[PDB]
Amino acid sequence: TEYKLVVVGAVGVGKSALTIQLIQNHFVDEYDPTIEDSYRKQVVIDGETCLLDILDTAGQEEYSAMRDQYMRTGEGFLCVFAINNTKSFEDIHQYREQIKRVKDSDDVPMVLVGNKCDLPSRTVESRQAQDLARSYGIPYIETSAKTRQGVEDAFYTLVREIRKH
Amino acid sequence: RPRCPGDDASIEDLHEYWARLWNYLYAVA
Amino acid sequence: PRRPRCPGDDASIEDLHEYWARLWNYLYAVA
Ligand SMILES: Nc1nc2c(ncn2[C@@H]2O[C@H](COP(=O)(O)OP(=O)(O)NP(=O)(O)O)[C@@H](O)[C@H]2O)c(=O)[nH]1
Ligand SMILES: [Ca+2]
Ligand SMILES: [Ca+2]
Ligand SMILES: [Ca+2]
Ligand SMILES: [Mg+2]
């Protein structure tokens, strides 16, 4: 089984760094012009193998019928905010509504991710994010693409949400 | 822009290419 | 099910789009 995962959220919240931690297991820039960067990973989750394709969306938002179609191909969505960016957190409602629109359903597998949890500059509190997530009936995971904390769990937990659809 | 996968390409080679194309086409809209 | 052909250097983003869609159909048909 294949899973199409889509990572969304506001500019600079760490969408690419999360994807890059998942697939490549590092945070510092590497230099390698020989290789194309990969968006596919084979993993075992709860004793069953799967192939994951990750759409790591641009933060810069716009109207696009083709982008809607790229997102429509997604089966589950990580909605990512950064714990030091209150606006990214307030944006999550808008990202949830956009996914509901594109998918034409209220029942879309989704996980809330609060990234950059290694930072000294927290402005959004765990409890606050837990409540939004509970309000939506979806799981909540805090992550750091720097240290890799939560990174597996975020994508794997989304897969778990797809398996219950 | 990802390089075309080739005529020797396995099904798995094509999935890898596809996931790349997906990200590319989204990014350049 | 026919394996679509990746288009050349010159092609449009819409031509890449078309391949993207065809390649999804082919990969779905064959799994
Ligand atoms: N300290 C820390 N920095 C992070 C983390 N994740 C991403 N960053 C940093 O935040 C900045 C933006 O990261 P990036 O992954 O490009 O975020 P993005 O959401 O893809 N950006 P865009 O929306 O512009 O496409 C970079 O400097 C990156 O190193 C994290 O967990 N901890
Ligand atoms: Ca590596
Ligand atoms: Ca547009
Ligand atoms: Ca545009
Ligand atoms: Mg990015």
Side-chain angles (χ1 to χ4, degrees), chain A residues 18-31:
Chain A
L18 289 169
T19 293
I20 288 176
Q21 270 288 14
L22 175 69
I23 303 298
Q24 299 183 38
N25 319 85
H26 67 88
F27 176 74
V28 294
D29 290 4
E30 291 180 357
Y31 186 57

Side-chain angles (χ1 to χ4, degrees), chain A residues 31-68:
Chain A
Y31 186 57
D32 202 334
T34 300
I35 64 128
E36 295 195 323
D37 276 8
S38 162
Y39 290 102
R40 193 171 171 74
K41 190 178 191 184
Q42 195 180 28
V43 297
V44 188
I45 296 157
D46 298 348
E48 200 191 334
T49 323
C50 42
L51 275 303
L52 312 177
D53 290 342
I54 301 85
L55 182 61
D56 172 35
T57 64
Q60 291 253 294
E61 196 164 357
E62 65 170 81
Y63 174 75
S64 171
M66 289 163 99
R67 282 190 170 181
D68 285 355

Side-chain angles (χ1 to χ4, degrees), chain A residues 30-148:
Chain A
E30 291 180 357
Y31 186 57
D32 202 334
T34 300
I35 64 128
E36 295 195 323
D37 276 8
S38 162
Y39 290 102
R40 193 171 171 74
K41 190 178 191 184
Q42 195 180 28
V43 297
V44 188
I45 296 157
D46 298 348
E48 200 191 334
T49 323
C50 42
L51 275 303
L52 312 177
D53 290 342
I54 301 85
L55 182 61
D56 172 35
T57 64
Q60 291 253 294
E61 196 164 357
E62 65 170 81
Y63 174 75
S64 171
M66 289 163 99
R67 282 190 170 181
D68 285 355
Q69 196 182 339
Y70 309 143
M71 285 200 292
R72 196 169 289 116
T73 297
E75 294 151 330
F77 299 80
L78 286 192
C79 303
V80 181
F81 69 92
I83 60 59
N84 71 335
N85 177 347
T86 299
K87 199 201 168 308
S88 74
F89 177 70
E90 295 174 5
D91 288 344
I92 290 279
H93 184 251
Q94 199 259 350
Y95 288 113
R96 184 164 170 81
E97 293 301 295
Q98 174 217 68
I99 294 156
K100 284 168 20 172
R101 189 191 91 241
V102 160
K103 295 292 286 184
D104 192 16
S105 162
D106 268 321
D107 175 41
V108 180
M110 256 185 263
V111 164
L112 189 57
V113 178
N115 193 40
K116 311 207 184 167
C117 72
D118 59 282
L119 286 181
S121 57
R122 181 178 291 275
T123 55
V124 184
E125 277 88 76
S126 301
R127 161 53 113 71
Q128 206 184 341
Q130 287 163 341
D131 293 355
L132 195 73
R134 177 152 37 258
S135 137
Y136 296 150
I138 74 188
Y140 167 65
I141 291 148
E142 69 164 42
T143 67
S144 165
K146 188 146 170 275
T147 70
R148 212 161 190 288

